[PDB]
C-alpha cells in the first residue's frame, strides 16, 4: 500500500550499489551511496540510507562535497595559462618560452565525467625550430 519511494537525495549523492531496484522497497533496507563525478563524501563514514519505518528513509546528512580539477600541472619551456580557475569542465592554453614552437597542443580539457578529476592532454612539447 505504501512501500519506500524514490530514495533519499543528498547534496551530490546518489545510490551506487544495485541494492536498489528502486521499485518498491519494503521498510527495512540499508543501502549505499555514490557521490557524483567531482565530489568527495564526508570523512567517509556510515553510508547507510535505511528504509526505516515510515517509508521515511533513515539518516541523510551530506555524504558528498566536491572534487574539482586540481590544476593541469605545468607544461615545459614555456608555461600554462589558467584564466582564473581550474574546476571541473575547465581547460588551459599552452604557451612556450621564446624561440620555441608548440608541438603537442595549444589547449587541454578538465573532464571529470569519465575517470574522476583528470585531464585529457598533459605535457605537449616546446620544440625550438
UniProtKB/Swiss-Prot annotation:
Residue pairs linked by disulfide bridges in the UniProt entry: 4-51, 35-64, 69-110, 96-126
Organism: Homo sapiens (Human)
Associated disease: Complement hyperactivation, angiopathic thrombosis, and protein-losing enteropathy: An autosomal recessive disease characterized by abdominal pain and diarrhea, primary intestinal lymphangiectasia, edema due to hypoproteinemia, malabsorption, and less frequently, bowel inflammation, recurrent infections, and angiopathic thromboembolic disease. Patients' T lymphocytes show increased complement activation causing surface deposition of complement and the generation of soluble C5a.
Post-translation changes: The Ser/Thr-rich domain is heavily O-glycosylated.
Tissue expression per record: Expressed on the plasma membranes of all cell types that are in intimate contact with plasma complement proteins. It is also found on the surfaces of epithelial cells lining extracellular compartments, and variants of the molecule are present in body fluids and in extracellular matrix.
Swiss-Prot/TrEMBL domain comment: The first Sushi domain (SCR1) is not necessary for function. SCR2 and SCR4 provide the proper conformation for the active site on SCR3.
Name of the featured protein: Complement decay-accelerating factor
Family: Belongs to the receptors of complement activation (RCA) family.
Effect of residue 105 to L: In Dr(a-) antigen
Function: This protein recognizes C4b and C3b fragments that condense with cell-surface hydroxyl or amino groups when nascent C4b and C3b are locally generated during C4 and c3 activation. Interaction of daf with cell-associated C4b and C3b polypeptides interferes with their ability to catalyze the conversion of C2 and factor B to enzymatically active C2a and Bb and thereby prevents the formation of C4b2a and C3bBb, the amplification convertases of the complement cascade. (Microbial infection) Acts as a receptor for Coxsackievirus A21, coxsackieviruses B1, B3 and B5.
The protein's assembly and partners: Monomer (major form) and non-disulfide-linked, covalent homodimer (minor form). Interacts with ADGRE5.
Superkingdom of this protein's organism: Eukaryota
Domain Sushi intervals: 2-66, 67-128
